[PDB]
């Protein structure tokens, strides 16, 4: 039977940084403000008043 | 949206629409007007409003804001009038059939928004005041 002094140190993997992978964006999630209305009105406003 | 684009962008079309929609004439878009407005009792009130706004300003069919107000009143006027309930005053804004889309008289919110800089119908800027006139080029 043995007894310990120093708590284990978690080894850190090295290499390229792991990119973001999830269903959505997270903190980088913002929204566009649209005039009051239904979903269709907002979608129409966004599509008709924007260029990509 | 198509009906409002037709009425706003063309003064002659707006005049024809108002004339056919006020005196119960044959309008090529009667079914559209009937299907857009639910059963109500605002017909005669809207027709009367049309009367005051045609008598006071016979030159109305050049300001797009006036065209929008006249088209709104005309669309309400020829709706499916309820047989039983008595006629009431026309509401400032109403609701389209089978949808949560609000149509407004002053066009401050909903399907038509007319700011001093521009008029937007259905989320698309139909009129941009100052640049890009409604009519094309030759």
From Swiss-Prot, chain A:
Its biological purpose: subunit of the RNA-dependent RNA polymerase which is responsible for replication and transcription of virus RNA segments. The transcription of viral mRNAs occurs by a unique mechanism called cap-snatching. 5' methylated caps of cellular mRNAs are cleaved after 10-13 nucleotides by PA. In turn, these short capped RNAs are used as primers by PB1 for transcription of viral mRNAs. During virus replication, PB1 initiates RNA synthesis and copy vRNA into complementary RNA (cRNA) which in turn serves as a template for the production of more vRNAs.
Subunit structure: RNA polymerase is composed of three subunits: PA, PB1 and PB2.
Homology family: Belongs to the influenza viruses PA family.
Cystine residue pairs: none
Localization per record: Virion; Host nucleus
Domain of life: Viruses
This protein's name: Polymerase acidic protein
Organism field: Thogoto virus (isolate SiAr 126) (Tho)
From Swiss-Prot, chain B:
Domain of life: Viruses
Localization of this protein: Virion; Host nucleus
Function noted in UniProt: subunit of the RNA-dependent RNA polymerase which is responsible for replication and transcription of virus RNA segments. The transcription of viral mRNAs occurs by a unique mechanism called cap-snatching. 5' methylated caps of cellular mRNAs are cleaved after 10-13 nucleotides by PA. In turn, these short capped RNAs are used as primers by PB1 for transcription of viral mRNAs. During virus replication, PB1 initiates RNA synthesis and copy vRNA into complementary RNA (cRNA) which in turn serves as a template for the production of more vRNAs.
Oligomer and partners: RNA polymerase is composed of three subunits: PA, PB1 and PB2.
Family membership: Belongs to the influenza viruses PB2 family.
Name recorded for this polypeptide: Polymerase basic protein 2
Organism per entry: Thogoto virus (isolate SiAr 126) (Tho)
Span of the entire protein shown here: 553 to 690 of 769
């Amino acid at each position: 039977w043995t007894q310990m002094k120093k708590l284990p140190l978690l080894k850190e993997k090295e290499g390229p940084p792991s990119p973001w992978r999830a269903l959505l964006l997270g903190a980088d999630s913002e929204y566009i403000v649209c005039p009051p209305g239904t979903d269709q009105e907002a979608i129409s406003w966004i599509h008709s008043q924007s260029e990509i | 949206k198509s009906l409002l684009k037709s009425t706003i962008l063309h003064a002659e079309r707006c005049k024809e629409f108002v004339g056919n929609m006020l005196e119960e004439y044959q309008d090529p878009a009667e079914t559209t007007v009937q299907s857009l407005v639910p059963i109500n009792t605002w017909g005669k009130s809207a027709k009367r409003k049309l009367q005051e706004e045609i008598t006071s300003d016979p030159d109305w069919h050049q300001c797009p804001r006036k065209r929008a107000k006249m088209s709104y009143l005309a669309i309400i006027a020829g709706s499916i009038q309820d047989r039983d309930k008595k006629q009431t005053n026309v509401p400032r804004a109403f609701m389209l059939r089978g949808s949560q889309i609000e149509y407004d008289m002053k066009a401050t919110r909903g399907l038509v928004v007319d700011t001093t800089n521009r008029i937007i119908v259905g989320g698309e800027t139909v009129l941009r005041e100052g640049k890009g006139g409604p009519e094309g080029y030759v």
